[PDB]
Structure formats: C-alpha cells, structure tokens
Amino acid sequence: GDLADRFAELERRYDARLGVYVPATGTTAAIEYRADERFAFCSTFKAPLVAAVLHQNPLTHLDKLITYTSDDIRSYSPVAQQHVQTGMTIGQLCDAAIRYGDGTAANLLLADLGGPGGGTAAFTGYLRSLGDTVSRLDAEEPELNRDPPGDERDTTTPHAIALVLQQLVLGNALPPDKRALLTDWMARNTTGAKRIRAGFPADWKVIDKTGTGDYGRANDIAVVWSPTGVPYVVAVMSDRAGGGYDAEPREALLAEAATCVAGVLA
Secondary structure, three states, X not given: OHHHHHHHHHXXXXXXXXXXXXXXOOXXXXXXXXXXXXXXXXXHHHHHHHHHHHHOOOHHHHHOEEOOOXXXXXXXXXXXXXXXXXXXXXXXXXXXXXXXXOHHHXXXXXXXXXXXXXXXXXXXXXXHHOOOOOOOOOOOOOHHHOOOOOOOOOEEOHHHHHHHHHHHHOOOOOOHHHHHHHHHHHHOOOOXXXXXXXXXXXXXXXXXXEEEEOOOEEEEEEEEEOOOOOEEEEEEEEEOHXXXXXXXXXXXXXXXXXXXXXXXXX
C-alpha cells in the first residue's frame, strides 16, 4: 500500500503517468505500478535490438561494413552523420545505438535483422522468441517516438520489457561472449546518468538503456546489482501526455521512482 501511494504522489507532483516493474526474486516480491499498461518504447528497444543482431550472427559479423546514404538520416544520429561516405560496421552501429541512441544506427540494425521492409516485424519477432507476446514495434526512427497517447503501436509494458531485459542480461538468451558485449555497451552509454542510476547508491552497479520521445515520454530499463552482487531488473516508464506532443520529459521522475525501488530492495 505504501509504495502505491508513493508512486501516485509522484504522478501528481510531476503531472505524469508512471509505470514501474521489478521482477520477483527468491527473497523479494515483484514491484508493480501500471506495470501492464502500454508505454512507448522510444529508444529502449535498442537494447533488445542489439541482442537480436548479436544472437543471429557470429562475432565476426560485428565487422561487417554497412553502407548507407544521407537519405537514411531522418532522426537524431550524432554518430551516423559523420560516416555516410565510409559506412559503419555492425559493431560500430551497435555501439552508436546503445551509447548515444543514434537513430539511424538503430534503423540500419533493424534492416540487418529483417531487411528494409521487414525489420520492425523481425525485431518484434525476436521479442516473441523470448516469450514477450505483448510488445510491438511498428515504425522505425523517428516515427516510433511520436505515436499518439492511447495508440498501441510501438509500445511495450514495464512488465514485458523487464522480463526481456532479465533474459538478456541475467539469463542465457545470449551466450556469455555476446551477452558481455551487450552489457558492456550498456555499462558505457552515461545518456542514463540522471535516471535509474541516480536512484541507486554508488556501490550498486547499474547498466541501462534510456528512451525519450514526444508527449513528455521518458523511460529507462536497467539491471542493477547490490554491493554483494545480488541482481534486480528495473523498468521505469513515463509520459506527460496532457501537455501535448511538446510536453517536457522529466528525468527526475524516473530517478525518484528508482529511489523508491532502491529503498525497498536495500
């Protein structure tokens, strides 16, 4: 009752909708708040996207050169903008997608996974293969960040995306080598310093992938480890849709939600 009341007060104070999921462990109950409501992925999908591309190919595929054109840049792409003439390798694209949320990098990874027409379906199908039957990606960048409130397109749920990230980082969806690549890129992003990371004490390890979008959308998905190595998965999702498409996202809402979780888990 206490935690639900705390999350409700966060919603009132930030004029926001908040979703939280933390899976159960052997000694802890699941934490859930709007955990089965749909929220836009925004860039959070880039973490399982990189997993999908790692999964389907040998490590040498990281060195495959991808060519692309200025026409492919229709989203914030601070890395891919600099390399149009030369192309980028798959590994470089993964790094860019995770560490900067480069949009074009994600689009090219989608096309590596499923071809130019089939990538969003292929990505969704990777989630299906991990037993996520809820989430859906229907558009690529930048449109996936812009669907109207209430539209199911390009959404996941805190519950669904937490269980996916759990399998990728704590489970064996990936072999150890590939899993370590994903976790290393996530451990090296910092877009997420002011989100879940800011709610956990410094002696807890945190790896994360953020997402930000229209309608004040701000998300973060993370795996955390206690100072003695005990892991938890934390998905926090939010929007401020009442302010319209240009509503300001509130990173501090996510930090506060994470602080609430950390207090329960400590």
